[PDB]
Design a protein around this ligand. Structure first.
Ligand SMILES: Cc1cc2nc3c(=O)[nH]c(=O)nc-3n(C[C@H](O)[C@H](O)[C@H](O)COP(=O)(O)OP(=O)(O)OC[C@H]3O[C@@H](n4cnc5c(N)ncnc54)[C@H](O)[C@@H]3O)c2cc1C
Ligand SMILES: NC(=O)c1ccc[n+]([C@@H]2O[C@H](COP(=O)([O-])OP(=O)(O)OC[C@H]3O[C@@H](n4cnc5c(N)ncnc54)[C@H](OP(=O)(O)O)[C@@H]3O)[C@@H](O)[C@H]2O)c1
Length: 295
């Protein structure tokens, strides 16, 4: 049974911020924060791949109360401390330049969160989501295609799979399959969780493969910016070789734009072997092995 909607927008849980820590190291673009909340007092229950709602303070350009924004849960069911006391979020600060006034414009909810203080209280809803759940099979192959903060569900998967204290805490799940993360960010300092993602890979080298698409330090073979789909095309045949296995699940989280190029890269690899990828993918979706969360 997957717990969904334990708290509803009509009556959110009031969490309290435990810590708000930076994820973009110096030299990096913008602000992405790891925010840990205290759950105790509601005992909000959740699993990996799900989202929560955050309702920020304030009203909009129309006088209306701000509605919730969804954020992917970045911690496992146990929280980062492995004690079932916390839930963590991975939040990029949304700011752009207004479309010809040119004034810096701030996103309401994300700017509230990335500047939120330890001890502050936040309205939390959920969890929601049943489409981004890991299979129970510990020998499953798990392809993880992520841009930016799309890393968030991938951290809940990879932590449950490979953190020492998670294995200790999950006797029913001792992962021994193969996981492959293709992770796209703009710079090397924008690789969220880089150190831990690389600890995992040296710790479990035959179980986790880690591939970077660093937008602004790497050009694809045709002189453009190196995106996730350029990595997919580069390893298109390796990927399609795993996707052909019925033990294999694919998770795509982040920009909706990564998709059509992922579909181009795999459609070519599929074609070489006589398969047409748009039908094959239609069947992977119906089977529930093609998991997509883009926003
Ligand atoms: C299922 C799901 C999961 C998500 N997970 C995460 C996550 O893990 N981390 C995360 O950071 N976010 C995540 N998001 C996005 C998050 O929900 C918010 O949309 C985001 O943080 C921005 O909200 P805000 O309140 O900061 O911005 P808002 O105040 O709502 O402002 C957004 C609005 O700004 C305007 N706008 C935006 N960009 C531009 C532009 N370039 N030019 C002109 N106008 C523009 C648009 O009208 C837009 O709809 C997720 C979204 C969903 C749906
Ligand atoms: N990535 C996401 O999950 C996402 C989701 C929704 C909105 N956005 C927009 O991007 C901002 C950054 O958020 P973030 O931290 O999540 O992401 P981020 O740190 O910007 O990482 C996103 C990466 O995706 C790359 N990218 C850009 N266009 C792409 C495309 N068409 N196909 C594949 N990859 C592409 C970007 O490359 P260049 O920047 O170097 O082009 C960047 O390297 C958001 O605040 C919002 O304005 C991003």
């Amino acid at each position: 049974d997957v717990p969904v909607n334990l708290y509803r927008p009509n009556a959110p849980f009031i969490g309290k911020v435990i810590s708000n820590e930076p994820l973009v190291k110096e030299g990096g673009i913008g602000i992405v924060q790891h925010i840990k909340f205290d759950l105790t007092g509601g005992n909000l229950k959740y699993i990996e791949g799900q989202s929560i709602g955050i309702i920020p303070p304030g009203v909009d350009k129309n006088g209306k109360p701000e509605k919730l924004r969804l954020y992917s849960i970045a911690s496992t069911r146990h929280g980062d401390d492995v004690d079932d006391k916390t839930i963590s979020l991975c939040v990029r600060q949304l700011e752009y330049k207004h479309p010809e006034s040119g004034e810096t414009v701030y996103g309401v909810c994300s700017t509230y969160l990335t500047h939120i203080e330890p001890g502050s209280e936040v309205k939390i809803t959920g969890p929601v989501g049943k489409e981004m759940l890991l299979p129970d099979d510990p020998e499953a192959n798990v392809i993880m295609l992520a841009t930016g903060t799309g890393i968030a569900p991938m951290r809940t998967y990879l932590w449950r799979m490979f953190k020492d204290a998670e294995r200790a805490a999950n006797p029913e799940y001792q992962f021994k399959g193969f996981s492959w993360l293709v992770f796209g960010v703009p710079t090397t300092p924008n690789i969220l969780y880089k150190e831990e993602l690389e600890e995992i890979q040296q710790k479990y080298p035959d179980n986790f493969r880690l591939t970077y698409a660093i937008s602004r330090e790497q050009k694809n073979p045709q002189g453009g910016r190196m995106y996730i789909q350029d990595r997919v095309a580069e390893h298109a045949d390796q990927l399609w070789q795993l996707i052909k296995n019925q033990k294999t699940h694919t998770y795509i989280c982040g920009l909706r734009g990564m998709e059509e190029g992922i579909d181009a890269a795999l459609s070519a690899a599929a074609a070489k072997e006589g398969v047409t990828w748009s039908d094959y993918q239609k069947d992977l979706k119906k089977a529930g092995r093609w998991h997509v969360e883009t926003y």
